[PDB]
Design a protein around this ligand. Structure first.
Ligand SMILES: CC(C)NC[C@H](O)c1ccc(O)c(O)c1
Ligand SMILES: [Zn+2]
Ligand SMILES: [Zn+2]
Lengths: 154, 154
């Protein structure tokens, strides 16, 4: 049904952004693109979380969206959360230019991410390869800097 | 299979609030309740708009959600937009304690309002009885005071 979606990211700090999603075929991949500003230079975990609940800011978004009950990985791993979109990279000006294609998320059906929350994190996602409990759950990406509900777009 | 949703309404003015949605059965009504502050005493149009797109504030939400291409009505009318939830009423302190039950909106299927935008309006919705062109589109409810994307809730 939905072929386009959009998310406005905001937080308590300076991190702000707009991410676009496009899926021209229901059984095809989703392109995810846009820009995030206000970030510290370097890598930042970038995940779809389960709830589109911003009533307590990014905290009420709950955990990584994981309907298949897998362990956390990078977006190229077979073992991954549906929500695991890896890292975005901020340049020296604090701007991350996002350009991702993904085959696991969907804008329709059981992996559908409309109505869930996109979150950019304080630290790099260790892609589930950090050798501890936390790595297998969250990637050690730490704090939530900005988030927004993924909405249907024209 | 969502059975709960939530929406944080924010705007450029004093209007803000949190609205909850619950739909225990997919063939059943959706209960809509919560609290919005900052509103002038009396009736305010309360609608689901088509896009969950807050890139230009409430303007980018587009028109009332209307997948059946009907004219604007009140929620008790057969001729209504899916998104036509009617009015909410703010008391003398500016508070609307919202409590609605509606069987045309849904949290799944064709009429699913997850990922769409809830908007509270400046003026009363005339429920399509205003006799002018605008009544059949917006109910003459006027500008958008606060809005948010409807998200899946726990
Ligand atoms: C937001 O700071 C705000 C609060 C109250 C108001 O009346 C207003 O116009 C704007
Ligand atoms: Zn994960
Ligand atoms: Zn309408």
């Amino acid at each position: 049904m939905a072929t386009k979606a959009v998310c406005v990211l905001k937080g308590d700090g300076p991190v702000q952004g707009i991410i676009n999603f496009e899926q021209k075929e229901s059984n095809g991949p989703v392109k995810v693109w846009g820009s995030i500003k206000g970030l510290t230079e370097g890598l930042h975990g970038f995940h779809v979380h389960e709830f589109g609940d911003n009533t307590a800011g990014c905290t009420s978004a709950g955990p990584h969206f994981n309907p298949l009950s897998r362990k956390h990985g990078g977006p190229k791993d077979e073992e991954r959360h549906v929500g695991d979109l890896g890292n975005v990279t901020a340049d020296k000006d604090g701007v991350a230019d996002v350009s991702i294609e993904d085959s696991v998320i969907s804008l329709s059906g059981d992996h559908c991410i409309i109505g869930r929350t996109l979150v950019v994190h304080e630290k790099a996602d260790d892609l589930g390869k950090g050798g501890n409990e936390e790595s297998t759950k969250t990637g050690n990406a730490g704090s939530r800097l900005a988030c927004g509900v993924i909405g249907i777009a024209q």
